[PDB]
Design a protein around this ligand. Structure first.
Ligand SMILES: CCCCCCCCCCCCC/C=C/[C@@H](O)[C@H](CO)NC(=O)CCCCCCCCCCCCCCC
Ligand SMILES: CCCCCCCCCCCCC/C=C/[C@@H](O)[C@H](CO)NC(=O)CCCCCCCCCCCCCCC
Ligand SMILES: CCCCCCCCCCCCC/C=C/[C@@H](O)[C@H](CO)NC(=O)CCCCCCCCCCCCCCC
Ligand SMILES: CCCCCCCCCCCCC/C=C/[C@@H](O)[C@H](CO)NC(=O)CCCCCCCCCCCCCCC
Ligand SMILES: CCCCCCCCCCCCC/C=C/[C@@H](O)[C@H](CO)NC(=O)CCCCCCCCCCCCCCC
Ligand SMILES: CCCCCCCCCCCCC/C=C/[C@@H](O)[C@H](CO)NC(=O)CCCCCCCCCCCCCCC
Lengths: 264, 264, 264, 264, 264, 264
């Protein structure tokens, strides 16, 4: 019997925002490793060399995300298990972004020549980096609300968020509506494809970004359904704060829908 | 009962050899795409920037390759199922190295500046790229038998070979010999330390090459020991020609050793 | 049953402060043997010759030491039988630091050349050696609050404290927390590594300090769990004040946790 | 049942000879590090400063060693299970000398000023270091047949041999002969005192050598008597070639004495 | 049952005092026989000829005397049969010192040359020999309160007192305290080494005085513990009025302790 | 059963002869530490100061020795078990004489002025010392066959031989012949008294000699009758080769007489 925990989702909600600030701080520090990073010519890519750069191609990437999260917002609203759905999204987005920091600290791979006119540079001090980090944190990295002036590094987060939201939408709906599922899938592919057409991330930048989110999503649900957190000392699951969130939930979550408002 | 099939092993051994030649050939094609790739400054790193270059560290990586191969050859001869072990080795190196070809064609990445004096280049025709391919193919990519004259590309194969031969040694010996397993782990780690200290491959090319082989190794034997190729249509295995190779075997291969010669 | 003795622990806490004062006096007598101990050329070591001196490496060891002290303090606050744990830590640090005084008097082995600028010296009298011993005594020997002005001698005390605290954290916590157990081990090995990297002790001064604390901790616990202080006359236990402290404790101390304050 | 294995003692003797040769070579290499090692002022010791040097105090140690070796050989002659006794001494001496090599490599601690007149030195090449190692090997390191011409390093080997021979003489004699035991103990302590009084080693070197030999002997005999090599997977015994030698011996070796000669 | 008698103790207590004055009085008489006793060269020895004189080694003997007496006084207070213990102290010390007076009169032996400077001498009459005897009697022969200013004769009394107070401490404590017993043995041996190192008594003076007290102590307790005074006419006890002192006690005195004060 | 072994007597007889030579060898070395020892004045005694020197007092002291052993020889000649008495004389005289060597090495006490005309001295060599020792060995120390020309040291052997012979004659006769026992006792005192009257040994020289022989005699017989060599591990009797001689003898020996010859 699952117990709706309205106090644990608060801890899960706080956890994801702390990781968001940490990632913004890291990308500022790694930015000053090399001063210029606009003189190199782009590496030979099979995709970035054929299609010409489209300046407005990236502008539609977050457009699909807004529709995707809006659709996900409604199914969250019309789902009775509001604590579990929100807590399983914050406990996964907070894990992938930690893997984003590790893979960009060891090496830095950007696109040499696009968005070459972003100003700032030589942030040599202790305190003025935080002001830049604060803008990154409370800007969502959007280009409409211009904060991300020039390009980003390996393991792009635009693919992470687009793919992560798609999987919750697809399988948290009744298995008889195979018309919305293909609508979510087609939007995700165009968003990923538009990233490459904007000459902002390499071809290998997205492939390992799409694989990590997909593998981590399936590994989490399989262990949640099998209920291995207390069945046996199998492998000491390495997910950050996993058993603390799934201890009160046993079995597979149902998909019963109702109406929250008391004014029909 | 496990029936030794000596005619399928011959076909599998041919399959893996075709991959090496095909993989070597595309190395010339991608090298022709870039004029030099030996002038640019290296991208910022965490390990290639701290330690200085060690000229003799590249040879020590392949010195440990013989030890792992020599031990594996000894284990192969003293195993009753010689046709079974050799078929999986040729069926795994064929798949992993096939992915190496794919990741090289989609994106090109190398460390800019070591081994910049390799001669030849600009082989513009059809009738000497094979000549260079044959020289590399019939040199096993070693540096002692110098064929690998200058730089290599992303997803280094010097780590795939070391890791694959490390897991076969531990897997196919009795589960009480955990000292050779310890020795086979020290050799693998040192072979990875020296390939990085020699300034030959980035810190991220090694990690994504130590993970793919490990993941593809456990997944292959899990599918075998569980025997899911005929129990049920679990996932429609994507391994190239997996149902053909392992159809005639049932259960798990034991770990008892025999002697083929009749002169004790 | 475990009877919390609040009068034996006070005797155990006093016993430590006598030993620490005694050790702080021996370090003054030993320092007067050799006048200079700063002109000799250093002995040929394998770790002190490769890694160059890191100026900030010794201030980081005590940073890793305070964190282990903060974690241990929380364990002592939330434990049912906090009296016995406090009595066992004070009964073990008073024994190892007695072995440090013995090996320092028998032979003096310092590092010839760091802290060569420390002034003072030639305290030839009885009346100010006690003053010098008090300065080291009420500074805990730490390098942050400047007391450790000159060099240090054999059987490093920094390694004894770090290893003793680390083994207490992983012993008196539930055997399902294999992330704090791994975190403490990481903090222990980095604290030891920064002692060698700061050129503060030889490679053999730290190895035998880590061994003795590890051996004496395991021996003490395997001797009290089997209630060997009264089971028979096995070997006439040589631990200082062993039967006096543990005669009221029978069997193994459980791992019950509670909250002492009555204000939820 | 105790089955006398006559084909393993040869392997043990070969292993010991290889270990001795490796120790001689490592000693030569270590001595090659520091050129002079004879101009330094000696460290302040408590035994090397009080008792003045005795010129003849180093031959008495080898006299006691030869007496103990003769007694041990006499014990070996009239024992039923002489093969097992000969197989146990070698497997312990090899391990202790490997530990000696390891502790000699990390740090070099010699006595600065005895044998300052020894000539030779600066053997810089590969071709005569082997000759010097062969001389030290087939000179047994003794001072009677002059090979020990220059100084000696940490973890003295005379104390190891004396303690091992004394412990083997005490162990495998009937438990009613408590006068030969006292004689052997007196010989061992006199040998140690004569090593210390000849200004050949520091006090800490002798103390750690004695402790290590005693602890290793006791641990090995406890493991052999408790029959832990096949009882369970207790700790994966780290003794080199332990389970290979004692697998044919079950229980504790009795103390039956006989006469191998059939000519009364 | 043991009945403590407080009347026999008073009579036994004054027995030693009349003997102590008699022992002091006989010293001047034997001293008057030979005038100088401070000019001849010493007899050949094995210990007085190797080690040199240590001026402060004579005081350290009596420093250890206070500790043995201080511990014994504590035992004599926290005991329940305090009347029994003190009677045997006066009964044994009186007999041994009575022999000490006898052995000087039959033969006089001393160390020729130590303490040659004492003034006075040639006290030929009856009315100041007692005065000199009273000075030693009221000074207890100590050197801190200097009355024993120059040399001592056969059968040194510094060994009798140290050994007698050693055997009462170990015997009249519960047979589980074998650490104070170990301390009481180290305290005795050091006192025996310092009296010899001060060139105050020959190497045979100590041994024939360490044996008589030990033999006379073991004989007294075995003769009493087995209760041979009234069981049968075993040997017609030669001890001075041994039967009178121990007639009222049967069996062995237990080792239980009481507390006389009524203010816990 | 009292089994007479004629082969153990020979081993016992050889043992006493080796000690006889060893004692003579010590006498030569001990004489050389002091050059003269003939200038000192004799120590003031209670007996040597009154009784004048008698030149013929030592003439007849050995005469009693022949008479005493002649009577003992007749008792040995007319005993049923001659072997057991012979091994109880050699195994007891061979222990006392070893105690004579120990007391002469630690100190040297002789009479300064008698036998002052002894010649030779200063035998500084390695080889010709034995000729002096050989004369002492094969001279039985007799003053008639003059070999022992010069003075003698502590623990005179003249009292040892007289007392040991006296006790064997006494208790190895039936307990109804208390007329010869008095005669043997009378001879012993006169022989001892003349030794002290010959100004050859001090008063304390003989008393310590009389006690040691008597105590060791009674301690041997009590242990032989009690049969403590195999009854229990009581005290590990310290007599040399004691259990080896009494293992085959059970109980106490009777005193029956017979005739050895077969020709009445
Ligand atoms: C609690 C779950 C909320 C998840 C919603 C997305 C949050 C992620 C926003 C940035 C996270 C900070 C760290 C990433 C920094 C950038 O290096 C990163 C990679 O280029 N940019 C984005 O993620 C660009 C973000 C692309 C996301 C578009 C999908 C639609 C989300 C809209 C919700 C945000 C409200 C703002 C509406 C205008
Ligand atoms: C019994 C099974 C043995 C199979 C062992 C692996 C065979 C792989 C043959 C590779 C032939 C060329 C294809 C690779 C081209 C390079 O882009 C690649 C990465 O730089 N280099 C290597 O793989 C070469 C790296 C070499 C380092 C590993 C050393 C172990 C090799 C063992 C084979 C011994 C044969 C040596 C004969 C000279
Ligand atoms: C039973 C209580 C244990 C508490 C922690 C251990 C305290 C032991 C301090 C030793 C006192 C002086 C005796 C030794 C002197 C030196 O020869 C010795 C070796 O160089 N120094 C240390 O051990 C110095 C090593 C210091 C590393 C430990 C750091 C943790 C200190 C915690 C105290 C926090 C107070 C901070 C207030 C600002
Ligand atoms: C299983 C065989 C055990 C036999 C006895 C032990 C042999 C070990 C000899 C080691 C050979 C050289 C390696 C070590 C060299 C030195 O770093 C080391 C101390 O400095 N030497 C010894 O320990 C040398 C110790 C010397 C003291 C022992 C004396 C007994 C020797 C018996 C041989 C008799 C031959 C005599 C012929 C004239
Ligand atoms: C409670 C029972 C205590 C009885 C302890 C024994 C009492 C012995 C008193 C000796 C009286 C004079 C006779 C001895 C004369 C000297 O030729 C003799 C040897 O040279 N010296 C000692 O015996 C002197 C021995 C030196 C060693 C010190 C041992 C004395 C400790 C007891 C006295 C404590 C008084 C302390 C007051 C400050
Ligand atoms: C196991 C059989 C033992 C029987 C008797 C053996 C006596 C041996 C005594 C001398 C042995 C040499 C070691 C001692 C050397 C001297 O430092 C020692 C002390 O002065 N001399 C004597 O004891 C000399 C004291 C001698 C007194 C009489 C001893 C009885 C001897 C009877 C034999 C007479 C044969 C004479 C034929 C010419």
């Amino acid at each position: 019997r699952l117990d709706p925990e309205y106090w644990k989702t608060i801890l899960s909600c706080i956890y994801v925002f702390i990781v968001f600030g940490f990632t913004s701080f890291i990308m500022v520090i790694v930015h000053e490793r090399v001063p210029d990073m606009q003189t190199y010519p782009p590496l030979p890519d099979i995709f970035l060399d054929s299609v010409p750069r489209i300046p407005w191609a990236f502008a539609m990437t977050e457009v699909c995300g807004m529709i995707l999260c809006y659709i996900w917002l409604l199914v969250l609203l019309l789902h009775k298990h509001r604590s579990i759905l929100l807590r399983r999204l914050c406990s996964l987005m907070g894990t992938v972004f930690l893997l984003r920091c590790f893979t960009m600290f060891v090496t830095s791979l950007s696109v040499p020549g696009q968005h070459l006119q972003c100003t700032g540079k030589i942030y040599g001090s202790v305190w003025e980096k935080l002001h830049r980090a604060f803008a990154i944190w409370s800007g969502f990295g959007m280009t409409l609300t211009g904060v991300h002036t020039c390009g980003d590094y390996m393991f792009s987060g635009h693919t992470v968020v687009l793919t992560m939201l798609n999987f919750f939408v697809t399988e948290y709906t009744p298995r008889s509506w195979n018309f919305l599922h293909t609508l979510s899938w087609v939007l995700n592919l165009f968003g990923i494809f538009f990233i490459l057409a904007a000459h902002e991330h390499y071809s290998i930048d997205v492939f390992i970004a799409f694989y990590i989110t997909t593998r981590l999503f399936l590994y989490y649900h399989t262990l949640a359904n099998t209920r291995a957190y207390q069945q046996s000392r199998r492998a000491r699951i390495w997910f950050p704060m996993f058993s603390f969130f799934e201890c009160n939930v046993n079995g597979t979550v149902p998909n019963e829908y109702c109406w929250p408002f008391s004014k029909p």
